[PDB]
Design a protein around this nucleic acid. Structure first.
Lengths: 102, 125, 216, 21, 205, 63, 38, 213, 219, 67, 61
RNA sequence: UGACGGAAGGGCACCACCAGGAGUGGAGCCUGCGGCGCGCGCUACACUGACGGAGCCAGCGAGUAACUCCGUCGUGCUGACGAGGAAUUCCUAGUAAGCGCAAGUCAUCAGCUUGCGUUGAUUACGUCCCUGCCCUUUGUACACACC
């Protein structure tokens, strides 16, 4: 009933009713690439061009749970495990992908 | 006329008066509803007299509580003491004395500072 | 009138406490007063209301209470209270210098002291010598070696404390501890609680003979 | 007045405390 | 005053300092200190017993001390007074540490369990409480009021129901397993209760 | 290492100890026989159980 | 002009040695005034 | 089979109570989110020295746990943690702020590693409490020490102090707040992952105790 | 630029050097101070009664110059701690251009002592300062402590550092006294080792441990 | 003999069970000598009975036929 | 007035310390001029407390 | 009851141990003390932030704040400073400490003093081992027991 789009240096989150931004986060410093909910749908991951991939809680934008660096290449995609709630797959242009554990 | 009971409750300087009477189940602190009680993190400190023993004991009474004095935490301890011993005194007078000492057993097993304040302090060592 | 009942029968006990949110120098000085008296205990004054303090002390059965007041570190007043609805004298302090300022020569003596009172002459002198000597430990020995001197010098009680030792050719001295020029300014028959009791005596600052006479 | 107040003696009962409140 | 019960003689007599009437006493099970409490001094007098001199007088109440006891194992003392207050003293071992516990009405008739772990007090409103003494926590209480038949006298002009001469107890005691309180008052009923289930189990006239 | 666990059975008095530490006669839990007099640092009650790195040295006074 | 009351006596070496020889005489003679038992 | 019917008219009272509150009347959870049961002290020797058998609602019980000797080892461990967390010269007295920041802390502890944060903090305490240390005995005023053992009250107290001041010192000048810093410190301490300040200081102290044994 | 550090971070792989007994005693004739040197007075040192040979800020100065020209100081894995025998824990941050002679160093030291600080030429970090005792307040938590030894066997410091990882810091106590017994910090040091059979000097000893750390980390 | 009556009750409470055991060995070699046994008999009896009363729980779990 | 006092203590409202007093011939001691108070549930005690509206009813009076 | 010691036993103490807490000493402004030095107060240096709103709780007195919530920004600084070093001082429950608010009571104090309210902890609550200080060495008191 909500959804996020990956704008440049901000992620915008909209509802199924008002059809505009109900929440957003815009204290990213570079262009961001990947926005992904966890399967429980409480927090959300976002990978940027800096390569410091940030996971933070959804339905509360102004908090940041943990921003962990990947390789210095721009982290293109980052998505959680489809059933596990604590392991997160990231991929930048380091020719290696990583299964981080939060 | 209508069956009522008035009890008190005191933390450091805050004082809470509780008029409990037969009613429909409304719990009001200075006209405000019981849900709209600041500082919002001790709302469960206010809730626990009406939460330890279940709302079915609150279904037939309604409570109005005046509070004066003290700060925030003193006011919420005064509120919960007044609510607790008002319910106990109502059940001591108008209904089951067996329910009275059931309620007294529950509150004293949880904490008796919810029934008797600890007044006489300090100590000259 | 409240000291013939318990003069030398029961040894007193004294609680010494500061004004309110005290300074570090004041708490040092209150510690020094506790070390000056025997069987006294310094009690931390903070958020102690004066009525519940004074009657909690009187139900704990202590005999005397000595509160202290300060001004920018310099102590300026003290107040002797006696508890079974006894009298309170209250004095100011003028030339107060302390061993924590002067010399760290180790510990004090804590022996049951001797007492000297120089020219307390009038009836107020007898009342104040009673209020000052009934806060000491009753009946010290002969070879007890610290003495306290309370010399009246024109209503200025000079207070000093010495450790003496007799030679055969005389006796030599070593003062230690506090040093006061205290002076009485009020005395009332109630405790510290009331501010309603009868004034037995207070000095008159503003009569036209305010400087001629002694023990006004 | 303060002396009467602190010597209230709170067992002070009369018969007029059903007209006074 | 002490009494030897072999030579059947007195051997010690402790007094106060001013001839006050005493009302309750207790004694350390290791028989080294004897404590007595009065109606008119608000104190607990402690005497050494191997030397008859007055050890001390320890205070803290502001009403007369109704009842005293010593714990039979850890030697802490429990007093109960008409300040609506029970008070726990640890005397021995460099400390002299007090701890107060408030109760609803004024207290009569303390009696502590043979384990020395909790205390039964018999308050003046017709109730009897039990306090664990490692904490200050009340374990539970028995409403002992509506089950003591108080006889209407010959000369009184009120009913036996609204009478309040004896609707309370004035001496309780435990059993020796710590499981059943017998209690008796100024009425013609002596009851006994069992403390885990907190219920009357017999009432004698 | 396998670490052992032991119930205090008596707090010693009168020992000339360093301030803070207190000598203590503790008794083991995997068995019930062998007692050993260690010395503890914090506040210790009767029958608290405490973890022991060793099982073969009882201490002595400190001074 | 004129003044209300005599101010604080500033403590001098001669007045502290005067009270010192006073206490020398007094504690030599042991004629002090303490409390006695009962 | 069998049933017990106690209520005979449902709860419809005039001030309409929240549904999660009238669902919490069936069983007490901390903060109306974490059930105190199925939480065990995994270690022995700290059982009955970390109070978890008596459930509370918030961590602001106003009992008196400093007058007797050992009765501060009976007030529950969560508010023991928050009372040690309030201790610094900048922020004394502010225990409502302390309560709400450990609320946010153990909430994100759950949303990272979901078992329940009270179990996380209990076995964090059992893993952080040191099991030996030394004492600086005189020995002629030399460099002289001797290993002793630690009573479990001192173990629990020093574990709580280490965790709280480690969270403060790791959150001194960083982007993270004290909430998430205490969260990651408690998670590392629960795994015993030799990374956090308290487990590092514990292994260091037991190392010097074993060395000067 | 590699990360130049202070005690704000106490986790990374680091070679901590702490110089013992760099005695800083300043007696101000009146004029100005004099230090503890053999060659600034023959008078005041024999008025204060201690012997002549124990005057040594120059040897700790050439030790810290050997370190400040050593390549680990430019790498960023050094954080220089000295301490006077009277307890003055002085730290040196590696942003410093040290006085390259004895006189400007000994004149900078009284500026440091009488301001408890000294600033840089742009003044955005404090680059040399005296800070809090104990020394464990500013050295890391898992920091394995060694010192210079004379009466103790010899190891290979290369694998002695190579057995550990970047999750740990290693500290060496350089005893820069004149002669005597190296029990100045036997509270702290729990393993005592030198790297030759006969006693060193302090500068070549700490340079031995620094080239051992360099062969360990391959620098 | 030279330790006093007052601190004796903890003086022979400090000692471990091995020292209790060699105290028993001493009691053997002292009651194999009736010269001094009869001149210290209430002292020996009070010490021995308090020792094994306090150490009774380990004593009856010892397994030594010579003991 | 003393006639009203004999009315009250003949109706059984007062006590000295714990025990109630029914006869007016009980003179008191110097000690017991302080615990002369009514019994609880004495409705004169209830009416004066409700006059001052400090009527607490948890303590049953 | 002549004096001087020694030994033994016992007690007590935040001028002791032990465990911690909070300060001082770093900057600026000030009152007082000494002969520039000292120390007490007040104001700083802090992603514990800055904002713009919202919220609601205090007791002392009558002479014609804090904290909380909602949205936003988002932390290497003052034209002399990044939390105070060496060491030292003080401190055990409604205590340390934070926050305000009144009043100005014949001496003291307005640069402040005294009250009152609010919020409220951590660590001991044992030990004589160290530093000391004190008491006793007929137990003399009336059984039992020990000496």
């Amino acid at each position: 009933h909500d959804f996020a789009v990956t704008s440049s240096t901000r992620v915008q989150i909209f509802s199924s009713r008002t059809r505009q931004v109900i929440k957003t986060f815009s204290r990213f410093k570079d262009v961001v690439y990947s926005a992904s909910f966890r399967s429980d749908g409480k927090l959300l991951c976002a990978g940027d061009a800096t390569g410091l991939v940030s996971v933070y809680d959804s339905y509360n934008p102004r908090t940041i749970l943990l921003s962990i660096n990947a390789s210095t290449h721009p982290t293109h995609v980052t998505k959680f495990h489809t059933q596990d709630n604590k392991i997160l797959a990231t991929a930048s242009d380091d020719r290696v992908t990583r299964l981080w554990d939060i | 006329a209508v069956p009522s009971v008035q009890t008190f409750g005191k933390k450091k300087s805050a004082t809470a008066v509780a008029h409990v009477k037969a009613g429909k189940g409304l719990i009001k602190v200075n006209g405000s509803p019981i849900t709209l009680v600041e500082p919002e993190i001790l709302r469960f400190k206010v809730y626990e007299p009406l939460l330890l023993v279940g709302l079915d004991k609150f279904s037939n009474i309604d409570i109005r509580v005046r509070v004066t004095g003290g700060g925030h935490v003193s006011q919420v301890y005064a509120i919960r003491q007044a609510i607790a011993k008002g319910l106990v005194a109502y059940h001591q007078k108008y209904v089951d004395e067996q329910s009275k000492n059931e309620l007294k057993k529950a509150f004293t097993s949880y904490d008796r500072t919810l029934l008797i304040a600890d007044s006489r302090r300090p100590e000259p060592k | 009138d409240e000291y013939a009942a318990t003069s030398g029968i029961m040894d007193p006990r004294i609680i010494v406490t500061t004004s309110r949110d005290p300074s570090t120098r004041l708490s040092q000085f209150a510690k020094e007063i506790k070390l000056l008296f025997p069987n006294a205990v310094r009690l931390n004054r903070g958020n102690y209301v004066m009525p519940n303090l004074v009657d909690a002390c009187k139900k704990s059965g202590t005999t005397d209470l000595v509160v202290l007041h300060e001004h920018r570190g310099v102590p300026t007043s003290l107040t002797i209270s006696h508890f079974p609805h006894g009298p309170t004298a209250q004095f100011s302090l003028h030339n107060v210098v302390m061993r924590h300022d002067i010399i760290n020569a180790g510990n004090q003596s804590e022996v049951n002291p001797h007492l000297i009172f120089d020219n307390f002459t009038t009836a107020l002198g007898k009342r104040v010598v009673c209020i000052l000597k009934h806060l000491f430990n009753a009946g010290p020995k002969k070879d007890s070696e610290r003495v306290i001197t309370f010399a009246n010098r024109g209503d200025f009680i000079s207070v000093r404390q010495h450790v003496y030792v007799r030679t055969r050719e005389g006796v030599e001295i070593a003062e230690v501890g506090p040093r006061f020029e205290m002076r009485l300014f009020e005395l009332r028959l109630g405790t510290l609680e009331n501010k309603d009791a009868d004034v037995e005596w207070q000095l008159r600052r503003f009569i036209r003979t305010a400087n001629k006479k002694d023990y006004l | 007045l303060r002396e009467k107040a602190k010597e209230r003696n709170p067992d002070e009962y009369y018969h007029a405390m059903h007209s006074r409140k | 005053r002490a009494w030897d019960l072999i030579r059947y003689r007195n051997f010690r007599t402790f007094t106060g300092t001013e001839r006050i009437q005493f009302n309750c006493l207790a004694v350390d099970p290791s028989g080294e200190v004897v404590c007595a409490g009065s109606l008119d001094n608000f104190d607990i007098h402690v005497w050494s017993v191997q030397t008859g001199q007055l050890l001390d007088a320890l205070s803290g109440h502001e009403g007369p001390v109704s009842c005293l006891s010593f714990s039979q194992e850890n030697s802490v003392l429990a007093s109960a007074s008409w300040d609506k207050t029970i008070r726990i003293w640890s005397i021995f071992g460099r400390s002299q540490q007090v701890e107060p516990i408030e109760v609803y009405s004024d207290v009569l008739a303390l009696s502590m369990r043979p384990d020395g772990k909790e205390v039964a007090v018999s308050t003046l409103k017709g109730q009897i409480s039990i306090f664990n003494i490692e904490d200050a926590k009340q374990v539970g209480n028995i409403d002992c009021r509506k089950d003591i038949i108080s006889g209407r006298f010959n000369q009184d002009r009120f009913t036996a129901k609204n009478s309040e001469r004896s609707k309370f107890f004035t001496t309780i005691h435990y059993s020796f397993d710590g499981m059943a309180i017998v209690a008796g008052g100024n009425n013609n009923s002596i009851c006994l209760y069992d403390v885990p289930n907190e219920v009357l189990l017999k009432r004698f006239i | 290492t396998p670490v052992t666990l032991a119930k205090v059975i008596k707090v010693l008095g009168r020992t000339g100890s360093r301030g803070g530490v207190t000598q203590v006669r503790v008794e083991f839990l995997e068995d019930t026989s062998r007692t050993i007099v260690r010395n503890v640092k914090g506040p210790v009650r009767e029958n608290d159980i405490l973890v022991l790195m060793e099982s073969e040295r009882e201490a002595r006074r400190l001074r | 002009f004129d003044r209300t009351a005599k101010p604080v006596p500033v403590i001098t070496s001669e007045v502290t040695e005067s009270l010192e020889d006073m206490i020398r005489r007094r504690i030599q003679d042991s004629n002090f005034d303490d409390l006695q038992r009962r | 089979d069998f049933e017990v019917v106690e209520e005979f008219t449902p709860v419809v009272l005039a001030t309409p109570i929240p549904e999660e509150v009238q669902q919490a009347q069936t069983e007490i959870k901390l903060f109306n989110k974490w059930s105190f049961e199925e939480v065990e002290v995994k270690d022995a020797s700290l059982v009955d020295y970390v109070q978890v058998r008596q459930p509370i609602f918030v961590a602001h019980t106003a009992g008196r746990y400093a007058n007797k000797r050992f009765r501060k080892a009976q007030c529950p461990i969560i508010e023991r943690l928050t009372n040690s967390l309030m201790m610094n010269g900048r922020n004394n007295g502010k225990k409502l702020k302390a309560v709400r920041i450990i609320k946010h802390t153990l909430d994100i502890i759950n949303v990272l590693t979901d078992q329940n944060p009270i179990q996380v903090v209990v076995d964090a305490i059992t893993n952080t409490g040191p099991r030996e240390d030394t004492t600086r005995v005189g020995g002629g005023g030399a460099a002289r020490r001797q290993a002793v053992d630690v009573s479990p009250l001192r173990r629990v107290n020093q574990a709580i102090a280490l965790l709280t001041i480690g969270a403060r010192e790791a959150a001194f000048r960083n982007i993270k707040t004290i909430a998430e810093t205490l969260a990651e410190e408690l998670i590392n301490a629960a795994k015993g992952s030799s990374t956090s300040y308290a487990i590092k200081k514990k292994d260091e102290l037991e190392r010097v105790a074993k060395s000067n044994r | 630029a590699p990360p130049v550090l202070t005690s704000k971070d106490k986790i990374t792989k680091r070679m901590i050097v702490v110089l013992a007994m760099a005695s800083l005693e300043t007696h101000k004739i009146s004029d100005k101070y004099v230090l503890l040197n053999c060659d600034d007075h023959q008078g005041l040192l024999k008025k204060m009664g201690r012997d002549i040979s124990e005057a040594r800020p120059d040897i700790t100065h050439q030790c810290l110059l050997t370190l400040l020209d050593s390549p680990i100081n430019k790498a960023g894995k050094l954080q220089v701690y000295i301490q006077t025998s009277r307890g003055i824990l002085i730290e040196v941050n590696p942003t410093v251009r040290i006085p390259r002679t004895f006189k400007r160093f000994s004149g900078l030291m009284v500026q440091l002592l009488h301001k408890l600080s000294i600033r840089s030429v742009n003044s955005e970090e404090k680059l040399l300062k005296v800070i809090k005792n104990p020394i464990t307040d500013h050295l890391p938590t898992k920091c394995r402590k060694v010192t210079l030894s004379f009466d103790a066997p010899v190891i290979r410091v290369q694998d002695y550092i190579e057995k550990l990882d970047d999750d740990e810091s290693i500290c060496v106590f350089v005893g820069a006294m004149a002669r005597g017994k190296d029990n100045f910090a036997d509270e702290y040091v729990d393993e005592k080792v030198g790297l030759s059979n006969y006693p060193l000097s302090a500068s070549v000893a700490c340079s031995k441990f620094c080239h051992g750390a360099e062969d360990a980390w391959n620098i | 003999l030279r330790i006093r009556m007052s601190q004796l009750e903890d003086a022979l409470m400090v000692m471990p069970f091995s020292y209790v055991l060699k105290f028993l060995k001493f009691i053997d070699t002292v009651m194999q000598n009736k010269t001094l046994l009869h001149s210290h008999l209430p002292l020996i009896c009070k010490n021995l009975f308090f020792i094994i009363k306090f150490n009774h729980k380990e004593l009856v779990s010892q397994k030594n036929e010579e003991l | 007035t003393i006639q009203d006092a004999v009315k009250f203590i003949e109706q059984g409202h007062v006590r000295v310390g714990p025990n109630l007093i029914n006869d007016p011939a009980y003179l008191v001691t110097r000690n017991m001029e302080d615990y002369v108070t009514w019994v609880d549930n004495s409705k004169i005690k209830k009416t004066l407390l409700r006059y001052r509206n400090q009527i607490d009813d948890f303590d049953f009076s």
